[PDB]
Design a protein around this nucleic acid. Structure first.
Lengths: 55, 56, 151, 117
RNA sequence: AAGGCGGCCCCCUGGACGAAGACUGACGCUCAGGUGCGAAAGCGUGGGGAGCAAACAGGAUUAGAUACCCUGGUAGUCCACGCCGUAAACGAUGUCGACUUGGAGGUUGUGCCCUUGAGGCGUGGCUUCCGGAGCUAACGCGUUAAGUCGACCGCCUGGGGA
């Protein structure tokens, strides 16, 4: 279900500064945190999410 | 770790928010860390040492 | 001392003036438990003072003293080899003690004839602020501002 | 000889030194002060106090250009981030922004050996 | 399998595990000699060379400082194709199988349940920490045994010399 196009949802699981957030904090199951981080890492390629907050 | 001062705010609240925005990012943790090369054998050892300790 | 936090002793006020702060000055000036002859020297060199700086005998002291009173000093302190002179803001009571003590080490150093001369001229020059007791207070206020970094 | 109005404080906070550099909004530097410039060698070079004077010694050097407001960018770890971003306020500028622009590699270049001390 | 493996995408590809059923019918376990795989350093031929950095140079420190610390810096580190065959290559614990009280977790499957909730009841696999009987010189190990047994292999027989 979790999906690199869905940049609404992916914003809950990054910072102000566009760092991926750890499962520790968010409470998320670790299967899905793998899928999340992979989603986010594609999103950043396509320029839908940012790497940083310099721009 | 970017911040502005919005209008009718003190200086001293913005300088506080700067610091609680930077300890939340861990800029300085992430810079202490790369001062010196740590061999991977040492990285794994310190990791273990923390995990075994934090059983308390 | 480690445990032993303590009070302190009531000195008698000075018999001529009723001045508790001036009794401490004869004690500081006294040698070999001769308080007698300390008082002779002090009471003298306030007459010679107060005459020659427009009167008030308590307050010709307390103008000359107010001038030499410090406000910060150093407090040397090792970190791991090199040794850090830290400025530290001095207590109310210790202000006077250091002032009084410096006046007298200045007075004991000069080359006039009596002690009651020597003292009178390093309470003259304090109040018109030159001479060695304020050259001491200036070269302490250097050290505090030169090492203002460290506090 | 000019006006600018809006500038940019670049503070560069190494462990040994700070450099404050005031620049206009497109990179072109107006003035700068260092801790080493302000009469401080060695131990005292580093301290958060001699970061201060650095600031001043620089806010002094841009009376000419008659700046009102600036943004503060802060680049580095050391002492005199927090001190220097306060001594530009109290020496009479408005502060719009405060930024942290400290280079983090995304694992990149092998640093030097651990020291054995 | 071990050595090991860390941005995202594609192409070629190995194994593991689970569910329900079907199929072969002991086809199994272990293995001297043999063959393969095997970190880092190092060697060969040819590329590359940012950063780091053995050697080497200068500066400090020091009784001295051929070092620790500082400024530089060459092989090397990187790629291709060959060799080398070693490590505290360690869980200092050979492989395979069977049996023997518990508790807390993690990870990955799967089946039943006003799925009514991120849940209730079970059932596989891998893994972390406690600890019982027993074992052990003791430390400890403790269903992933160093407990109770069986099969095959490797190895030890005072310290130096080595």
């Amino acid at each position: 279900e979790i999906d690199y196009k869905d940049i609404a949802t992916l914003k809950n699981y990054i910072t102000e500064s566009g760092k991926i957030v750890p499962s520790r904090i968010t409470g998320t199951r670790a299967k899905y945190q793998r899928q999340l981080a992979r989603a986010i890492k594609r999103a950043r390629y396509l320029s839908l999410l940012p790497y940083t907050d310099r721009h | 770790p970017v911040i502005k001062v919005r209008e009718n705010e003190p200086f001293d609240v913005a300088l506080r928010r700067f610091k609680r925005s930077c300890e939340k990012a861990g800029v300085l943790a992430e810079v202490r860390r790369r001062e010196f090369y740590e061999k991977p054998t040492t990285e794994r050892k310190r990791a273990k040492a923390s995990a075994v300790k934090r059983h308390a | 001392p480690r445990r032993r936090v303590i009070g302190q002793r009531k000195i008698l006020p000075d018999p001529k003036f009723g001045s508790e702060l001036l009794a401490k000055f004869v004690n500081i000036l006294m040698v070999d438990g001769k308080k007698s002859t300390a008082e002779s020297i002090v009471y003298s060199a306030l007459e010679t003072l107060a005459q020659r700086s427009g009167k008030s005998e308590l307050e010709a002291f307390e103008v000359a003293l107010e001038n030499v009173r410090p406000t910060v000093e150093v407090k040397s302190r090792r970190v791991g080899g090199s040794t850090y002179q830290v400025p530290v803001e001095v207590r109310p009571v210790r202000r006077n003690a250091l002032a009084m003590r410096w006046i007298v080490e200045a007075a004991r150093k000069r080359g006039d004839k009596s002690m009651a001369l020597r003292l009178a001229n390093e309470l003259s020059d304090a109040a018109e602020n030159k001479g060695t007791a304020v050259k001491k207070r200036e070269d302490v206020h250097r050290m505090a501002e030169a090492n203002k970094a460290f506090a | 000889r000019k006006q600018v109005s809006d500038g940019v404080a670049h503070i560069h906070a190494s462990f040994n030194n700070t450099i404050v550099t005031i620049t206009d909004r497109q990179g072109n530097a107006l003035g700068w002060a260092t801790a080493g410039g302000s009469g401080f060698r060695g131990s005292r070079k580093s301290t958060p106090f001699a970061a201060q004077v650095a600031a001043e010694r620089c806010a002094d050097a841009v009376k000419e250009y008659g700046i009102k407001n600036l943004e503060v960018m802060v680049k580095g770890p050391g002492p005199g981030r927090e001190s220097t971003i306060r001594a530009l306020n109290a020496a009479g500028f408005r502060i719009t922004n405060i930024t942290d622009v400290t280079p983090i590699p995304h694992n990149g270049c092998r640093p030097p050996k651990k020291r054995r001390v």
